[PDB]
Design a protein around this nucleic acid. Sequence first.
RNA 1: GGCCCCAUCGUCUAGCGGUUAGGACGCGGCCCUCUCAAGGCCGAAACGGGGGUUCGAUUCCCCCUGGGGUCACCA
Length: 468
Amino acid sequence: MVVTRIAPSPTGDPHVGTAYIALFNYAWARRNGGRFIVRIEDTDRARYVPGAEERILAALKWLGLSYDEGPDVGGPHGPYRQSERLPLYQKYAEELLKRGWAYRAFETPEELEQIRKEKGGYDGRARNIPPEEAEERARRGEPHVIRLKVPRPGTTEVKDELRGVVVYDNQEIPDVVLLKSDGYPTYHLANVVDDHLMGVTDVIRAEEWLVSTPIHVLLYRAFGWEAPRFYHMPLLRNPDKTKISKRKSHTSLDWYKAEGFLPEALRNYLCLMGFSMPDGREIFTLEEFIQAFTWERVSLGGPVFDLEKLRWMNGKYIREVLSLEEVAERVKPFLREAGLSWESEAYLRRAVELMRPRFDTLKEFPEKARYLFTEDYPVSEKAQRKLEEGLPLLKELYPRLRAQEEWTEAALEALLRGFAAEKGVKLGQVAQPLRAALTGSLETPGLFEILALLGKERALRRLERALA
RNA sequence: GGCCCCAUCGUCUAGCGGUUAGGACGCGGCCCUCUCAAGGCCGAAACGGGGGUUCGAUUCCCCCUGGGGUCACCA
Ligand SMILES: Nc1ncnc2c1ncn2[C@@H]1O[C@H](COP(=O)(O)OP(=O)(O)OP(=O)(O)O)[C@@H](O)[C@H]1O
Ligand SMILES: N[C@H](CO)CCC(=O)O
Ligand SMILES: [Mg+2]
Ligand SMILES: [Mg+2]
């Protein structure tokens, strides 16, 4: 069948590049009723960030993806954390030695740097070490690494399913280290070994790994194993077209969640990075994407991640995809974080409905509608101005208000339209100053609904401090 | 620089020899309207250059240019 995987390295915040690549592996596996695996690639203790693993795993779930095998879901080919598979790579690196496909190299990092300077890149000098001598030096405990012994001279063919075949000259492929002197494997060794043993048949990964594939094809040959299909996804870019990075763009999935972006929208946006629906539709579900996916509709240019379009899309989801109640629920954590509370679900729902078309992120809701949940709201200079200018006619409306029994949006509008008429003045001239009295702002939803919302007593109580 | 990949509006893109080169974000205008939004409508905006192949290139081939990626005891 079809087995795909995402192999995140726990060395920093959950990366948007990770979600993007994971998204396509998940779809390609589901499209073929296959398996989507999660393998944690923690082979470098130096860059290892404790707690990054749980974070990436939670972020993939948050985004909506589900995996069939992995660290916290089990599976027949675990462990799914490379740090727990060390004896394995060890066993295979040694197998390469016996097959004459690898060799031990004892140079210190300092000599290597010197060799890199003198000849630019390791020159494979350790190949001239007699195997028996290498062995003895290893048995004595002499620190060393195991390197890939590239067949020189020669040529190596790599086949990308989206680009075609690429023929490499073996002189462009280095005798890369497979096993480090601390006993850990390098990405090259572990990736091929683990993909084989886990049964992956479809490697979908970012284009940044394209040139490293020949190294992988050689390893698969060395082991006498069948290579999987390779599909390299174009890299996500910063506005300047360079591979998206932490300083030129927001790459942290935690930032997006913190900013109030809906996972559903972020996911939908990610789908448009390199792919497009047959009919041209832009808003669609994860499940629809899975079902319409095809490599034929994947474009290879490096897509610039447009934060602006994402906000737009996020707003689009909030008002057209999620239900009112779903939006009301998602907005709570942000209200809590803002230190605000709501009277009841009923109140909250109504508040969210009024503001629905006016915020593009969940975080903006407590900011633009703060006056709806606390008296501790700011008053803009322009609002304070409109209020002062309208104080006279507001004083004359107050009594009519406290006299109004039917406190409804229909009645209220009728009461005000009349007041503006009987006063020979445009509605806005009365509406705007009142709006500033109730909201401390001149940018809000409709006055009647805003007026109704709080109820007669509450409204007048606020209108009073403004006239006081 | 060597090697590799890529190339349609500013950005994400549709196109798979013949189209007024379409959509989306953003931008500008109009309508709606009690503000601000949302929404509707209109508009400005692209095939990097040069050769070919061909009756006919955005589309197929080649060169170059440009952009990106990679060349670690990191992934
Ligand atoms: N900027 C990016 N754009 C697109 N895909 C990316 C990007 N960065 C990583 N990926 C891909 O997403 C997956 C995430 O792998 P990983 O968690 O190790 O992220 P990473 O950025 O490569 O981390 P590291 O710093 O250790 O190299 C891989 O399949 C990788 O190819
Ligand atoms: N550990 C690597 C994370 O980038 C795996 C990349 C891949 O081969 O798909
Ligand atoms: Mg473009
Ligand atoms: Mg046009």
